[model samples]
Target: GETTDGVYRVMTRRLLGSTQVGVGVMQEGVFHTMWHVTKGAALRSGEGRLDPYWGDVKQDLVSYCGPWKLDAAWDGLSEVQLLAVPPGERAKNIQTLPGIFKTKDGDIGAVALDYPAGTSGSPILDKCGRVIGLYGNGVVIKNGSYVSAITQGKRE
Candidate 1:
């Protein structure tokens, strides 16, 4: 299958005696994931950033300025699941793309899974619920367009 340019926050399990690992999401619906670390590495290595198995190793994380791959499991889902451990309990956060509603003053008003203007190659939605757009390309909103206004009464 062709690769899509969506972002993802992923975690991986390390293999014995191997520096490489397989990546997966710590959460099921949010696009954010906790940082992965070696079994015995210092827990205080870094804050607010993902550290690979090694200092020199680099990989994709779901954050701003990313082109991370969206796994097939995420098909038809707008939010990505992420694992979060609170002070005394484990929790989950459905991390979604930033900016829910775009305002006329160039500000984001709300956070929603709506189609912005200039969204190309997204799954198409018909007037009466039919396929309309293809998936994979990055979506951008045009200046002076209101994402909220366009998606009103369209999303479930």
Candidate 2:
């Protein structure tokens, strides 16, 4: 099968351990991910070798443009979609999951989704496929899970 075009498996080298893996997405020609994923992972902005690793099994990869966005919000959105490139031994590809937006606190909101680890930098999309938030921190409860959100905003 063909890989999802915009999603990618981001790899970064940590200072005191093995490499770390996170997910990323491309929008308007810029690659975006969580800050924590590349904070201490030796990844930099500007021109270099940072590829969007895709394909059903991640068998193919293509480097993206140098700059990074380091990715946004909720509202008029209840049911949402999460695209994540989870770490797996085989069949590694972008995985889509269903999610529900709960509410907002400060700069973050709450989303419920049955997600796994190593999916920190996934992108949350609305029904029309508009990016609305970033998926990363959250807590697992007895019945289900709730992820912390990073809603998109403007600088006006």
Candidate 3:
């Protein structure tokens, strides 16, 4: 769970009160991404990124610096995709810290963010390309079977 020291993994979200805010990264995962990263940010408004839900849906907001993709979900037992992942985080490893899904089947499993390295606790995404678990560390060539985790937001 490591990342490029200076690599920027950004995020943002909309609140129920008609607000927009920036996000932060912490050793424990995205700094309360579901909560606007901070209370001040919750009240503070701005523009410049993707989106989430305002009150209930509690969507996610983020992107990766990885030049490639790394994450997966249950497609089929024999349905193998031409994918590769060695361990964890390197900008696109949504697996390093395997994320949880709202509607996604934890039993399904993911197949993206495999490396060159493993998932850096990617903004674990969902089928609709929405954020799931906002966890992970730094970047490096990560590829493995195990995973890690941090706190994530939930839908109200």
Candidate 4:
């Protein structure tokens, strides 16, 4: 299925995370997610733009180059779900990635689930469809994924 809005499959081209692709959620005209996912390319790279794809047939590629930030947290919750396009597929599609809250040494931003590659920056949604976390990989002693708590993000 395609993303409704605010969610997107963003693309970046840089030396390290070159041509890196991942999921993102838009807010106030700025997309938020993993730094490696969306911040791969230089601000001046790709004409100083961030390409976000959505809609059917890989349509709707919007370029955004605005001030981005990473602020993370969450607690007292379990049974969280993530959204992303399946592996080896185009960015136009999207699917839910089920996960459970797994605290690591009191770490507030971690989930117990194994996701496919290219799902680094998917948005973790709660039961009410509110995004509570931003999926990413960091220190995972056990087989799980790490995420940053997304307190608030406006829908597109």
What's the TM-score of every candidate structure? 0.20, 0.56, 0.25, 0.52
Question: Per-residue alpha-carbon lDDT of model 4 for 1-156, expressed as tens digits?
Answer: 222247665554444554536666665555555655544433322344444332121211222444433223334554556565544555432334333334563334445445555666666666666666566554455445443333222234
lDDT of each: 0.26, 0.51, 0.31, 0.48
Model 2 Cα lDDT, one tens digit per residue, 42-126: 3443455444322111111122344433324455435566665566632232333334445463334456554455677677776
Model 1 C-alpha lDDT per residue in residues 1-156, reported as the tens digit of each score: 112323221223344442222122222222221122233132221254432332211221221112222333222324332222222223333244333333475432222343322221222222333321222222335664333211111111
Query: Which ranges in model 2 have alpha carbons more than 4 Å from their true place?
Result: 1-5, 12-20, 40-47, 50-72, 89-108, 140-146, 153-156
Error of 3 at 44 (Å): 11
Candidate 2: worst-modelled 10 consecutive residues by lDDT: 54-63
The C-alpha local distance difference test score for the whole of candidate 1 amounts to: 0.26
Question: Of models 1 and 2, which has the larger lDDT?
Answer: 2
- Candidate 3 Cα errors over 4 Å, as ranges: 1-121, 137-146
What lDDT does model 4 reach?
Answer: 0.48
Specify the poorest-scoring 10-residue window by lDDT in model 4. 54-63
Candidate 2 global CA lDDT score = 0.51
